[PDB]
Amino acid sequence: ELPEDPRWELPRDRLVLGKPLGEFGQVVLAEAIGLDKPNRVTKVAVKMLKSDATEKDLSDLISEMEMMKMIGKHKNIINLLGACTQDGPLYVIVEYASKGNLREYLQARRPEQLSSKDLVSCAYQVARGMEYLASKKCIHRDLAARNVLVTEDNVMKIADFGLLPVKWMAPEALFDRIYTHQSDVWSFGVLLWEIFTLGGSPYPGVPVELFKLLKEGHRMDKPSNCTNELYMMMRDCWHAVPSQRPTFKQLVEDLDRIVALTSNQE
Ligand SMILES: CC1(C)Cc2cccc(C(N)=O)c2O1
Numbered sequence: 495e496l497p498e499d500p501r502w503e504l505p506r507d508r509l510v511l512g513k514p515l516g517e518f519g520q521v522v523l524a525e526a527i528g529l530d531k532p533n534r535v536t537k538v539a540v541k542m543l544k545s546d547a548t549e550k551d552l553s554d555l556i557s558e559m560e561m562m563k564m565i566g567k568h569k570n571i572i573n574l575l576g577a578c579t580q581d582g583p584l585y586v587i588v589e590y591a592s593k594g595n596l597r598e599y600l601q602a603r604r605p606e607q608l609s610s611k612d613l614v615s616c617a618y619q620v621a622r623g624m625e626y627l628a629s630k631k632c633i634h635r636d637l638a639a640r641n642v643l644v645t646e647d648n649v650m651k652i653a654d655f656g657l658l659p660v661k662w663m664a665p666e667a668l669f670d671r672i673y674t675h676q677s678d679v680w681s682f683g684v685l686l687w688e689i690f691t692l693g694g695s696p697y698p699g700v701p702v703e704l705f706k707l708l709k710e711g712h713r714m715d716k717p718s719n720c721t722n723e724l725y726m727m728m729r730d731c732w733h734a735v736p737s738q739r740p741t742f743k744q745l746v747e748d749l750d751r752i753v754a755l756t757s758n759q760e
Pocket residue numbers: 515516521539541572588589590591592643653654
């Protein structure tokens with residue numbers, strides 16, 4: 495049974511468990527009383543084990559928690575806020591994202607409507623998030639709009655960074671199971687694509703074939719209504735040669751400038 499860690503422990507009774515948010519494991523909205531230090535309530539997401547869950551399940555949850563502990567805080571990832579480890583089930587508590595994941599965020603604002611500059615900023619923020627994770631030697635393995643969540647203030651937060659997704663894998667990860675900062679940049683390219691199709695499905699019509707088509711040099715076409723600059727960036731992200739993809743560091747610099755030049759009025 496679990497060891498306490500005073501750094502993160504929040505007494506169980508400071509948590510008012512509200513409605514479910516998603517579900518291997520359930521996630522509930524919750525209000526947490528006195529998280530900073532007192533009589534303030536803060537809305538949060540509380541991760542816990544499903545009813546019939548084996549010791550496999552538990553162990554991973556602890557791992558995720560333990561991992562978030564080590565990675566630390568960034569504006570653009572879903573942060574750890576605390577946990578209830580003593581005297582009842584494990585509850586891991588993380589920042590709450592009121593607007594949901596980016597896929598559904600974007601789909602719901604197809605013609606509410608997101609400007610040109612918002613769509614680039616969305617990209618910048620996720621890049622930053624991954625830039626941070628990358629600096630902390632974190633390798634995501636499943637970066638995608640489904641796994642980026644959006645808060646009440648429209649701040650993009652990478653999620654699940656501490657745990658058909660094939661359509662998001664770089665080919666070397668797909669074939670030889672090699673994941674890296676570079677394969678995560680591949681995944682970012684597909685995510686840039688999801689952004690500027692407002693949540694489009696990748697490789698529509700292609701059965702999972704796709705192994706070979708990627709080997710033959712198949713790349714998604716540019717979305718209707720995406721600049722060529724941003725299509726090239728997707729294309730750079732999808733380099734056949736991993737060492738030849740840009741890094742998140744450079745991606746951030748590029749999106750930064752691009753954001754600055756992008757029309758708010760469009
Ligand atoms: C743990 C997780 C990434 C899963 C999940 C589902 C639904 C909402 C949230 C959230 N943190 O707001 C959430 O955080």
